[PDB]
Ligand binder design. Structure first.
Ligand SMILES: CC(=O)N[C@@H]1[C@@H](O)[C@H](O)[C@@H](CO)O[C@H]1O
Ligand SMILES: OC[C@H]1O[C@@H](O)C[C@@H]1O
Ligand SMILES: [Ca+2]
Lengths: 131, 129, 131
């Protein structure tokens, strides 16, 4: 009965290229596999997971969705641009994960990311099937 | 009886009132009747962990707010002039029996999509407790 | 125990069906990377979603078939049309029978999808529960 699910928002400082994007405010964290201090989900139960985010922004934003166990690599990059305006963008991915593998979002030079009441950014994930 | 799933849609060319609950009047699927199209609210029958997500089309500014039992959980805003975009948002919530979930707009209330651009709200139980 | 779940992206894609040619995840192999079609084996309720990158005008729809007959549905568009990255997104639950197919279709008049290495477009789906 593996009940694994997290949702965390960001309330935080301008992000640097290659910096892990921390979502510091936990809404949900069943099984405690997301760590708000690091911004990383770490797989304890091998299986299939869905990851998803929604990011508020006031300019150009690209984010790398990362997977790995010490040296992570980008699976995909999502970009959504905005000229002198406010936007919300989204990305998602089904991933097979093994024990110890982390999943997280990583910043780029395109770093317009807002995290506030009234313009939230959220990172979520859940177990689909263990194995 | 023991599961929970819905996808509802807002089939109308007229936007919500400012600062009001968004009613999704049409049903794609809603087998347990957990979303009530007459009130615009989801009410939990089976307690446990739910995923909620929406994609809303708009041709002027739109903020969508998700509420749980009277408290604002998350807000996402998209600004546009004349042209059409999709505002999305979503969250995972562990709910007790009787808890209500709904979407609302603030002063940015536009949900007027162009032809072929619609608005949808989905939810489903992933882990019963 | 069935674990049908997939994500596929655009890299070297080959009509109005949007083919996501590069498989990231395809548990139980329900998704066909050569055609862009998901095939239902396990009847039940599924979630499908896409996040697709455009720079001009794009309108997409998740469409299905039953006994080979096409079932049209809602659409989702971004018509900003300014040459900058925009992510159009959409998703829905579908109740499917064995043999039903699901895919993403573009509007023949509004079908710009970014082609390149800078960022990604994705189509995902998973079983929520059988029957
Ligand atoms: C054999 C196989 O599964 N690999 C195929 C590859 O040959 C093909 O080029 C591509 C279509 O774009 O889809 C991959 O999954
Ligand atoms: O107030 C507008 C909304 O009410 C609902 O019944 C359907 C519509 O989208
Ligand atoms: Ca944008």
């Amino acid at each position: 009965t593996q009940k694994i699910a997290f949702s965390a928002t960001r309330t935080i400082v301008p992000l640097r290229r290659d910096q892990t994007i921390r979502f510091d405010h936990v809404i949900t964290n069943m099984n405690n596999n997301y760590e708000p201090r690091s911004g990383k989900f770490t797989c304890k139960v091998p299986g299939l997971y869905y990851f998803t985010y929604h990011a508020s922004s006031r300019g150009n934003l690209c984010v790398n969705l990362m997977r790995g166990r010490e040296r992570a690599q980008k699976v995909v990059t999502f970009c959504d641009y905005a000229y002198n305006t406010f936007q919300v963008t989204t990305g998602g991915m089904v991933l097979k994960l093994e024990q110890g593998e982390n999943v997280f979002l990583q910043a780029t030079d395109k770093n317009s990311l807002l995290g506030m009441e009234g313009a939230n950014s959220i990172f979520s994930g859940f177990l689909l099937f263990p194995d | 009886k023991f599961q929970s799933v819905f996808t509802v849609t807002r089939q109308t060319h007229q936007p919500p009132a400012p600062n009001s609950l968004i009613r999704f009047n049409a049903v794609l699927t809603n087998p347990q009747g957990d979303y009530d199209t007459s009130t615009g609210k989801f009410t939990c029958k089976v307690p446990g962990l739910y995923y909620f997500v929406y994609h809303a089309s708009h041709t002027a500014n739109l903020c969508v707010l998700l509420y749980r039992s009277g408290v604002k959980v998350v807000t996402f805003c998209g600004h546009t002039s004349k042209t059409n975009q999709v505002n999305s948002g979503g969250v995972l919530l562990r709910l007790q029996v009787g808890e209500e979930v709904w979407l609302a707009v603030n002063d940015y209330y536009d949900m007027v999509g162009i032809q072929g651009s619609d608005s949808v709200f989905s939810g489903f139980l992933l882990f019963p407790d | 125990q069935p674990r049908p779940a997939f994500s596929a992206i655009r890299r070297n894609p080959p009509g109005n069906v949007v083919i996501f040619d590069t498989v990231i995840t395809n548990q139980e192999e329900p998704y066909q990377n050569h055609s862009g079609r998901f095939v239902c084996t396990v009847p039940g309720y599924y979630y499908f979603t896409f996040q697709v990158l455009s720079q001009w005008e794009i309108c997409l729809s998740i469409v299905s078939s039953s006994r080979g007959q096409v079932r049209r549905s809602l659409g989702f568009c971004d018509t900003t049309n300014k040459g900058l990255f925009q992510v159009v997104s959409g998703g829905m639950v579908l109740q499917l029978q064995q043999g039903d197919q699901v895919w993403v279709e573009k509007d023949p008049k509004k079908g710009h999808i970014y082609q390149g290495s800078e960022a990604d477009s994705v189509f995902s789906g998973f079983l929520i529960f059988p029957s």
